[PDB]
Amino acid sequence: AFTVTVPKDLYVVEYGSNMTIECKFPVEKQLDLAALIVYWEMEDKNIIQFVHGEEDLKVQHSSYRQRARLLKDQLSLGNAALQITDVKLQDAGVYRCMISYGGADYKRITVKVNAPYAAALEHHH
Amino acid sequence: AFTVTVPKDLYVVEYGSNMTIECKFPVEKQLDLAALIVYWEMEDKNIIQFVHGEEDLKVQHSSYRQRARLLKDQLSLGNAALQITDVKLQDAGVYRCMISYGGADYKRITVKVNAPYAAALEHH
Ligand SMILES: COc1nc(OCc2cccc(-c3ccccc3)c2C)ccc1CNCCNC(C)=O
């Protein structure tokens, strides 16, 4: 029974930092990239789409353009690792990793973004 | 590549009525149940978990128990098709059909529920 697992449901992130949120999936022996699909999104806005070896950007949101990448190395360890650079308050919310690999599942991750007044005022207006 | 499509992404349903919301996915010749996974949910509540031929009857969310089922005959046609009976105001919201079949994709469907005053409470 194919189960995606998350070591951390919740990340607390400082504005301007970078984060890597992780989804684990079973890999017996060596990853077959041709059978792997990974979607990452937040609030039905798309971040990563990894179909049989390559990312696509085809339904990606601009807010994440040039800021998000999936660590390909980690896939062969069974780790779907999403790195977001230069975290913005807009990045707070609920992420989903959807994984299809001879079986399919998905998990939610909640991200909380702390920021000081200057950053928060800009976001507010 | 593999695309789930929704001809109709908006349903307007009457309280107490029935609805059938549909997602299409391509089938080449004969359907292969072993490769097929169909998952249906609404704003993070499980409705249908159909894995390699078998509906998992015991994982359905309580508020949908005995009201929701996947029309298995429609899969042979490349139509997921979630049939919901005795529609409640709680049924309004965004549904998702997630489909894996030699490829994977998902789509959103919005449901609105019309209801008379008495039903609308609810509300308390
Ligand atoms: C969300 O639940 C499930 N969802 C399933 O289907 C999800 C699904 C189905 C079809 C396609 C996709 C998909 C995959 C990649 C990209 C796009 C869609 C997904 C995530 C199947 C079984 C389950 C139940 N497994 C529970 C195991 N988790 C535990 C024990 O923690």
Author numbering:
A (entry chain C): 18 to 142
B (entry chain D): 18 to 141
What did the paper state?
We further show that they inhibit the PD-1/PD-L1 interaction by inducing PD-L1 dimerization through PD-1 interacting surface. Not only the inhibitor partially covers the PD-1 binding site in each PD-L1 molecule within the complex, but the interaction of the two monomers fully occludes the PD-1 binding surface thus preventing the interaction with PD-1.
Having confirmed the affinity of BMS-202 towards PD-L1 and its ability to dissociate the PD-1/PD-L1 interaction, we crystallized the compound in the complex with the target protein. The obtained crystals diffracted to the 2.2 Å resolution. Four protein molecules found in the asymmetric unit are organized into two dimers with one inhibitor molecule located at the interface of each dimer (i.e. the stoichiometry of the BMS-202 : PD-L1 in the complex is 1: 2, respectively). The inhibitor is located roughly perpendicular to the dimer pseudo-symmetry axis and its disposition does not follow the symmetry of the dimer. Both the binding site of the inhibitor and the intermolecular interactions within the dimer involve the PD-1 interaction surface of PD-L1, providing a rationale of the mechanism of action of BMS-202 (ie. dimerization related occlusion of PD-1 interaction surface). The inhibitor inserts deep into a cylindrical, hydrophobic pocket created at the interface of two monomers within the dimer. The 2-methylbiphenyl core of the inhibitor anchors at the very bottom of the pocket. The extended N-(2-aminoethyl)acetamide moiety of the inhibitor provides additional electrostatic interactions, but only with the A monomer (and corresponding C monomer for the second inhibitor molecule contained in the asymmetric unit). In the case of the PD-1/PD-L1 complex, Tyr56 of PD-L1 is rotated and rearranged towards the PD-L1 core, while the Tyr56 sidechain ring in PD-L1/BMS-202 complex is considerably moved towards the inhibitor molecule thus creating a T-stacking interaction with the benzyl moiety of the latter.
